[PDB]
Amino acid sequence: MHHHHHHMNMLVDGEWRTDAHELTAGDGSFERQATTFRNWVQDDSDARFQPEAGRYHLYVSYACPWAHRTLVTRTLKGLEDAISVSVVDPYRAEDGWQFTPEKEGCTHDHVHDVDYLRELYVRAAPDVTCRVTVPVLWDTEEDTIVNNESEEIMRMFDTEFDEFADHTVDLYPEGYQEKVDQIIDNIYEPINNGVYRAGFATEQEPYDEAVAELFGALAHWDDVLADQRYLAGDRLTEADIAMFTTLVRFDNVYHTHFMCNVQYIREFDNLWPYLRDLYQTHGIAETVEMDHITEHYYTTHPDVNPHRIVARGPDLDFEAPHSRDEL
Amino acid sequence: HHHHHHMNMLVDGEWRTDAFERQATTFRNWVQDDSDARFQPEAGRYHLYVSYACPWAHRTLVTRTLKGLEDAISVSVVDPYRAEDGWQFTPEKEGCTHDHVHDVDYLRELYVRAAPDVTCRVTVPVLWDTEEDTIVNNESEEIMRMFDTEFDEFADHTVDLYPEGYQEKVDQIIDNIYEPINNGVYRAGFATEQEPYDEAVAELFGALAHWDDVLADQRYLAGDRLTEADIAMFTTLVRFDNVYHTHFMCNVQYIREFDNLWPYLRDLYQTHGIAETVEMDHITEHYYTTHPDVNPHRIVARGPDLDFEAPHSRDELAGE
């Protein structure tokens, strides 16, 4: 959420720029100058955005682990019929996230048929100063951006659309919520944001800390997952979805491209069968587009990988059997 | 050979940033233990120029230590950090020495001195004759066999890294792993197009899986005894999991993830003397800092926690 690639652009007072130097001195200063979108869809008769069956639209990239969080939840809940989705081009440049429908896995902007994602922001907030990112939950009635945060879109997908979900799945169950909210908050900095902090690191000391904290955090949850099947233990929750979207991209991208190369995830005793256990959860596998993932990270970051060569990566057997059902 | 995108060159004696191997001159003279030869083996005549980072130069160091020619043949260590002026001498720096021959600032000076208008790339290793005041040899394999066979009169240990009855296999292994393994990682690393990288990675890991199969039932590459072929493989393997895997994006599988290649590497490392010839800090610093078009912000990766010193069981297989 907080770390962005060296050539990432911006919208300033409703204007697309390649860089705004007056807002880019010091660690992530632009984001403290940025506006985000934090409205909620609430199952409440008084609420502004009430959950309907054919109203809200979702914008994602298959490569983004933050957007991927919304996709995994949408599939688990069975909200595809209820909530439509557009897939942006995994490759992006001077114009940010773009729509390339002819490209495999990508579609067109189902709402306004825009060329770029930045057009959608401008329509929703003509004077906005922010980053054009995914995911974006869009309301077709008010014609604007409802929410812009992976964590909260996942949550409201989980707890607010029960009337239209096809599956009786509860990824935020009673008695687990406090711990689920705890795990999500913990793994957020050393693991979710940690890999990008290490990858876009410009000095040695920040990289060292980002790597040390990361694999330290991974080792902790590896010991925790030795005696309990999931992060919150007995049940599959949002906490697992947050962890999964990072882990699934670690050995093909983060390890090499972002130089987080202390250890493979597949070398961990418990995290690797855990990742296989999640990947094989019915429906999740179809939300994983590795071709989108590898193409984005290896060819969209010029200052990290100049010649834009897509690395091959390990031959990962995600479909390899586990034994964590014995927990 | 595949060199990095910022690799400069010596052209007609001049030092230039911008312009090729097939347009370049090399040094291919030999030291021969024969009465007529131009360069004959002596006990305090030849000087070795190496970098602890470079695997090619690493071959000459390993062999030198094995035979016991540390007192016969002197050595200088250039600065792991290279730039606008090529390999340089920085005596203050840990592990580095000064030019013991002419107190030269940049290795390129020695090349020009030995050959006034040479067109070549300033590389290591460099075998230097302090009598004719010129470069003797310039290739890793030739200097290695030179150190191994011709200097028997000035050795300290009676080791034979090129023994009779095994020689024919030794030489063939050496040029069978040259392109896919030894030079392959650089082909993949400095690749600018997707297709060559795909090939380079494919042939490299195809080759690694092969010798991992072979070394499962035999202790060393040529079989029964330690060998120059093992020296060529070692200087690459010991730089894989820390550099080649990540920096050069050869990330299909760790060397430590192999059944046989990993204890085999631990077997070579722990052999007497080979432990001291490894300077991982020189290795990690050079590749992550001297390749601006491979690693722009020049951040040194942490790498895995490799325990080369961990006990193995390949002594169970018959060998030294």
Author numbering:
A (entry chain A): -6 to 320
B (entry chain B): -5 to 13, 23 to 323
What do the authors report?
Glutathione transferases (GSTs) constitute a superfamily of multifunctional proteins widely distributed in nature and they are found in both eukaryotic and prokaryotic organisms. The main role of GSTs is the cellular detoxification of several xenobiotic and endogenous compounds, including drugs. Xi class GSTs form a distinct group of GST enzymes endowed with glutathionyl-hydroquinone reductase activity and show homology with the Omega class GSTs. The present work describes the cloning, expression, purification, crystallization, and structure determination of NmGHR, a GST of the Xi class from the extreme haloalkaliphilic archaeon Natrialba magadii ATCC 43099.
NmGHR displays the canonical GST fold with a N-terminal thioredoxin-like domain and a C-terminal all-helical domain. Furthermore these values are comprised between 1.2 and 1.78 Å when directly superposing the dimers. As expected, NmGHR is characterized by an extremely high content of negatively charged residues which are evenly distributed throughout the surface of the protein. An interesting feature of NmGHR structure is that the histidine-tag present at the N-terminus of the protein chain to aid purification is ordered and visible. We could model in the electron density the complete tag including the initial methionine of chain A, and almost completely also of chain B. As shown in Figure 5A, the tag sits along a wide cleft between the N-terminal and C-terminal domains of NmGHR. However, it may also be noted that, under this framework, the amino-terminal group of γ-Glu-Cys is as close as 1.4 Å from the side chain of the methionine (-6) that precedes the hexa-histidine-tag. This suggests that, in our experimental conditions, the histidine-tag partly occludes the enzyme’s G-site, possibly explaining why our soaking or co-crystallization experiments failed to recover γ-Glu-Cys in the crystals. Therefore the absence of S-glutathionyl-hydroquinone reductase activity that we detected with the classical substrate for Xi class GSTs, i.e., benzoquinone, might be due to the position occupied by the tag in high salt conditions.
